[PDB]
């Protein structure tokens, strides 16, 4: 059974990074799963539906990198995108 | 859709789940911003040999306690994952 003692910091720090990153209209959803002592993270951000895919791709990837570099106990981070018209 | 309550919702709900009576640990937690609301899916590890009516009461006490205590939450779902340490 996974320990879980880091879930709260992981979710908070990752959400805070995602929410204020460039081109994000808001966070759509965030999911954390305890595995061993660490957390697997799935975050999904709202972006402009007219963004080019190569642009949404850079945005998602900057967020992923920044979460990986800054947030302890994160094992695996996926950042997905939901298009919205603005 | 603002998302400013996600952090408190996830932290408070996680804490309630994790310190409830028959939970070995939290398996996963998911929050989704809907309008001003957060929709919450939380999944707890319980003893595989618990009776189903018991795990049902446990999940339901956690759901109620989250609904009663955590602001900005709608449609809380509490799911169960059995684990046999045996």
Swiss-Prot record, chain A:
The chain holds residues 213 to 291 of 293 of the full protein. Residues 10-86 are annotated as: C-terminal domain (CTD). The gene is mamB. This is Magnetosome protein MamB. Zn(2+) binds at residues 40, 42, 78. The isolated C-terminal domain (approximately 213-293) forms homodimers. Forms heterodimers with MamM. Changing residue 42 to A: Isolated CTD does not bind metal. This bacteria has on average 16 oval magnetosomes of about 81 X 58 nm which contain membrane-bound crystals of magnetite (Fe(3)O(4)). It is found in: Magnetosome membrane. Belongs to the cation diffusion facilitator (CDF) transporter (TC 2.A.4) family. Plays a dual, essential role in magnetosome formation; required for magnetosome vesicle formation as well as biomineralization. Probably binds and transports iron. Requires heterodimerization with MamM for stability. Residues 8-86 are cytoplasmic. Signal peptide: none annotated. The C-terminal domain (CTD) forms a V-shaped, dimeric metallo-chaperone-like fold and binds 1 metal cation (probably Fe in vivo, structure determined with Zn(2+)) per subunit. The CTD is probably responsible for hetero- and homodimerization.
């Amino acid at each position: 059974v996974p320990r879980g003692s880091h879930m709260n910091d992981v979710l908070v720090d990752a959400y805070n990074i995602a929410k204020d990153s460039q081109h994000v209209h808001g966070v759509h959803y965030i999911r954390g799963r305890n595995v061993g002592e660490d957390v697997h993270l799935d975050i999904n951000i709202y972006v402009d539906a007219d963004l080019k895919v190569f642009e949404s791709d850079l945005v998602a990837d900057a967020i992923r990198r920044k979460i990986e570099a800054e947030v302890d106990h994160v094992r695996d981070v996926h950042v997905g995108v939901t298009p919205v018209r603005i």
